Amino acid sequence: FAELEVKTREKLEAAKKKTSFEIAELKERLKAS
Amino acid sequence: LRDNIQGITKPAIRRLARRGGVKRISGLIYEETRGVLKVFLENVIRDAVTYTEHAKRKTVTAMDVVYALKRQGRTLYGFGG
Amino acid sequence: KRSRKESYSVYVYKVLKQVHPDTGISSKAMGIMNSFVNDIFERIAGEASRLAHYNKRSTITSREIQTAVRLLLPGELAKHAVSEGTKAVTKYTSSK
Amino acid sequence: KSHAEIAEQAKHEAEIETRIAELRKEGFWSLKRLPKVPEPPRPKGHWDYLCEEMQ
Amino acid sequence: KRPEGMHREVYALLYSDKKKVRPWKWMPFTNPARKDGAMFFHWRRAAEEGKDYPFARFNKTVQVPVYSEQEYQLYLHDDAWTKAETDHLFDLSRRFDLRFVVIHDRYDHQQFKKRSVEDLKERYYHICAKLANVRAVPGTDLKIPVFDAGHERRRKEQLERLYNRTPEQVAEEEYLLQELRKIEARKKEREKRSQDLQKLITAA
Amino acid sequence: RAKAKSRSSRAGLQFPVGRVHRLLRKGNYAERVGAGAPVYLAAVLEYLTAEILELAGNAARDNKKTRIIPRHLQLAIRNDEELNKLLGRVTIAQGGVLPNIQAVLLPK
Amino acid sequence: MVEKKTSVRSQDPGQRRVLDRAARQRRINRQLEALENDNFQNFQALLEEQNLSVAEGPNYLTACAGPPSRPQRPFCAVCGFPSPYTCVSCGARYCTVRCLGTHQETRCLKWTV
Amino acid sequence: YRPGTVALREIRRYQKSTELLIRKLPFQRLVREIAQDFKTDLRFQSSAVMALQEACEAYLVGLFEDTNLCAIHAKRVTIMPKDIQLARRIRGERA
């Protein structure tokens, strides 16, 4: 279970962080303009 | 899906029995009720699906259930349109 | 591109509004009122059908309809139904 | 998403600009319909009876 | 033998299941609702010749106040309106039952300066208000919200720009219309979603 | 031509004789329908509709309600001796049952 | 043209199911309270302060005379004249065939709901 | 509360309402699990499942009305499994 959960999170947290940072950057740039 | 006959709880049966005049219920009667209800449901559902497979449909409409109930001598009013 | 479905709601409200001027009828109760009409129509027409076929007849008639109403409706229910229909057939053939 | 959305969203920002421009030009809707109508109606009126009877 | 003698269907159903002396007359009648005594003619029975007309009840005159010369001079006086300019408005009011979309069109623009509908309405209403004000004390409901002309001049206007819009504002506006959703979604689906993601990545 | 008169009107019915006879003409209930069958069938259909609507509305009034619910139908069709017979093998959706509590299951 | 009432066929009394006994009482009671009723064709407050006033001593409730020695007289209720007859269903009284006709058409069984 | 006083109250209360007595969500999975054995991937109209429930609650209430008469047969107040069985056998369901 620990290994399967880590294999899941290795995808999940990567996608989540990418999405989070990209969104934050988009929103802040668009509001600055 | 699995183990859905248990979705008919002891209070769920006791209320139905109260509406039927029953005052005191026994311990085993809940399982008897589950068996009887399961048989009746399976028959009605099978007959309804007989009208769907023949109709080449993928969704069981209300008319199918109404007709299945009619074949069982259980004419139901309220779902005729 | 419409999909219109027929029902008896318009004439069950004429009859209800006439036989209960102050009383309305809910949509869910009118569904029952519709299913009841279709059910009895099926029953009386089927019994008249069988009646005609038993006498080796290709036509379901109002005489067979009256005998099917005698078979279907219980004693009083029958009497009233038979009388109502019988009187409706002499008011219709007199060109009123 | 994608960083390319900067362009799409910028176009949407332009949609805001035009929105503002158009709202300065003429507006989107006929706001505040009949806020104040103090005139009392007639009892029913001769002319209205004529209209009804001709109806 | 079968009695029958009646209609086939009804017969089978039944057995198989065992001086005017009221002369109308062409008649004169006067309408009591008229003040001119005009005699008209009518097609009435003999038994009602002489009864009053039944269409005289459909005569409910619209009410309109009638200021007097002294009263007008004291309180109804208005620098922008003269008596000859003001009596005409009330005559048109009465002859057109106090409706102001048809009073306007028949306004005498030859002796009289051009007025919009709103100014005529406000003028007649201030006149009604001050007429009742001469009474006032006799419980004359001094709570009358007489027709707003300012806001309403506007409200007429800021419909007219939206009336004649060949495309764009009638057509292209669809775009901005959709934007109302977009502007109301993607900004919060932007700055708020960002702040939520900043907190989510802060805890992460 | 002549102002067309319907078949519910000439007879004096509310239920559609045209529609009734129509379900019969293309219903294969027979092979050549006559000219009285739909009239009789519609007359009796609507007669029973009235017969019940009566009891349903009366029970409804007993409940101090102005709208007939399916309850005003279960209670009625089970309250009348012959409607129950006619509709004995018929369940009315959302109607309920009648409070028939057995005498032997009561306080003593 | 047609007799123009078979369309509405209001009463159609093949299933008439008379109203009787306690129902009569209800009607009687209703009529009484209607004769005791008010402008519209506080009473709850009156009933409340009257139910405050309940006691065995000399008071509002205990000041009622009661039944009369002189027995009740019949009256027609359609024209108010002395009435030899009673309506078999609702028990209201009348004095002619004509009066029974009017009563059957307007007041018999129709206002018992 | 004296055993049978709160139960008779419920008899008088559930014989006067008309709402369904089985929970919806639990019963709809049973109707889909039973359908399972006839066709993989069958869809149900919402009203179709409601009609199934309206069928079954009425059937069970009738069966519990006919089962009570059998319980009162053996001088009992409790309905016993043989009561459901006797009612159903006299019904021809499992003769």
Curated annotation (Swiss-Prot), chain C:
Keywords: Acetylation, ADP-ribosylation, Antibiotic, Antimicrobial, Chromosome, DNA-binding, Glycoprotein, Hydroxylation, Isopeptide bond, Methylation, Nucleosome core, Nucleus, Phosphoprotein, Ubl conjugation. The modification N6-lactoyllysine is found at residues 14, 56, 79, 87, 91. The modification N6,N6,N6-trimethyllysine is found at residue 56. There is a cross-link at residues 5, 91 (Glycyl lysine isopeptide (Lys-Gly) (interchain with G-Cter in ubiquitin)). Its main location: nucleus. Monoubiquitination at Lys-5 (H2BK34Ub) by the MSL1/MSL2 dimer is required for histone H3 'Lys-4' (H3K4me) and 'Lys-79' (H3K79me) methylation and transcription activation at specific gene loci, such as HOXA9 and MEIS1 loci. Similarly, monoubiquitination at Lys-91 (H2BK120Ub) by the RNF20/40 complex gives a specific tag for epigenetic transcriptional activation and is also prerequisite for histone H3 'Lys-4' and 'Lys-79' methylation. It also functions cooperatively with the FACT dimer to stimulate elongation by RNA polymerase II. Phosphorylation at Ser-7 (H2BS36ph) by AMPK in response to stress promotes transcription. The modification PolyADP-ribosyl glutamic acid is found at residue 6. Changing residue 84 to A: No effect on interaction with VRK1. The modification Omega-N-methylarginine is found at residues 57, 63. The modification N6-malonyllysine is found at residue 87. It comes from the Eukaryota. The modification Dimethylated arginine is found at residue 50. The modification N6,N6-dimethyllysine is found at residue 28. This is Histone H2B type 1-C/E/F/G/I.
Swiss-Prot record, chain F:
Transmembrane segments: none annotated. The modification N6-glutaryllysine is found at residues 85, 108. The modification N6-crotonyllysine is found at residues 26, 108. Keywords: Acetylation, Chromosome, Citrullination, DNA-binding, Hydroxylation, Isopeptide bond, Methylation, Nucleosome core, Nucleus, Phosphoprotein, Ubl conjugation. The modification N6-(2-hydroxyisobutyryl)lysine is found at residues 26, 64-65, 85, 108. It comes from the Eukaryota. Core component of nucleosome. Nucleosomes wrap and compact DNA into chromatin, limiting DNA accessibility to the cellular machineries which require DNA as a template. Histones thereby play a central role in transcription regulation, DNA repair, DNA replication and chromosomal stability. DNA accessibility is regulated via a complex set of post-translational modifications of histones, also called histone code, and nucleosome remodeling. This is Histone H2A type 1-C. It comes from Homo sapiens. The lineage of its organism: Eukaryota, Metazoa, Chordata, Craniata, Vertebrata. The chain holds residues 12 to 119 of 130 of the full protein.
Curated annotation (Swiss-Prot), chain G:
Belongs to the ZNHIT1 family. This is Zinc finger HIT domain-containing protein 1. The modification Phosphothreonine is found at residue 62. Induction: Induced by DNA damage. Pfam families: zf-HIT. Residues 23-39 form a coiled coil. Component of the chromatin-remodeling SRCAP complex composed of at least SRCAP, DMAP1, RUVBL1, RUVBL2, ACTL6A, YEATS4, ACTR6 and ZNHIT1. Interacts with MAPK11 and MAPK14. Interacts with NR1D1 and NR2D2. Interacts (via HIT-type zinc finger) with the RUVBL1/RUVBL2 complex in the presence of ADP. Interacts with histone deacetylase HDAC1. Interacts with histone H2AZ1; the interaction results in recruitment of H2AZ1 to the MYOG promoter region. InterPro entries: Vps71/ZNHIT1 (IPR039723), Znf_HIT (IPR007529). Residues 42-69 are annotated as: Interaction with NR1D2. Gene3D superfamilies: 3.30.60.190. The lineage of its organism: Eukaryota, Metazoa, Chordata, Craniata, Vertebrata. Zn(2+) 2 binds at residues 87, 90, 103, 108. Zn(2+) 1 binds at residues 76, 79, 95, 99. Residues 14-23 have a biased composition (Basic and acidic residues). It is found in: Nucleus. It comes from the Eukaryota. One of its GO terms (cellular component) is nucleoplasm. A zinc finger (HIT-type) spans 76-108. Keywords: Chromatin regulator, Coiled coil, Metal-binding, Nucleus, Phosphoprotein, Zinc, Zinc-finger. Expressed abundantly in liver, but weakly in skeletal muscle, ovary and small intestine.
From Swiss-Prot, chain H:
The lineage of its organism: Eukaryota, Metazoa, Chordata, Craniata, Vertebrata. This is Histone H3.1. The modification N6-glutaryllysine is found at residues 16, 39, 75, 82. The modification N6-(2-hydroxyisobutyryl)lysine is found at residues 16, 24, 39, 82. The modification N6,N6,N6-trimethyllysine is found at residues 16, 39. One of its GO terms (biological process) is chromatin organization. GO terms for cellular component: extracellular exosome; extracellular region; membrane; nucleoplasm; nucleosome; nucleus; protein-containing complex. The modification N6,N6-dimethyllysine is found at residue 39. Acetylation is generally linked to gene activation. Acetylation at Lys-82 (H3K122ac) by EP300/p300 plays a central role in chromatin structure: localizes at the surface of the histone octamer and stimulates transcription, possibly by promoting nucleosome instability. H3R2me2a is present at the 3' of genes regardless of their transcription state and is enriched on inactive promoters, while it is absent on active promoters.
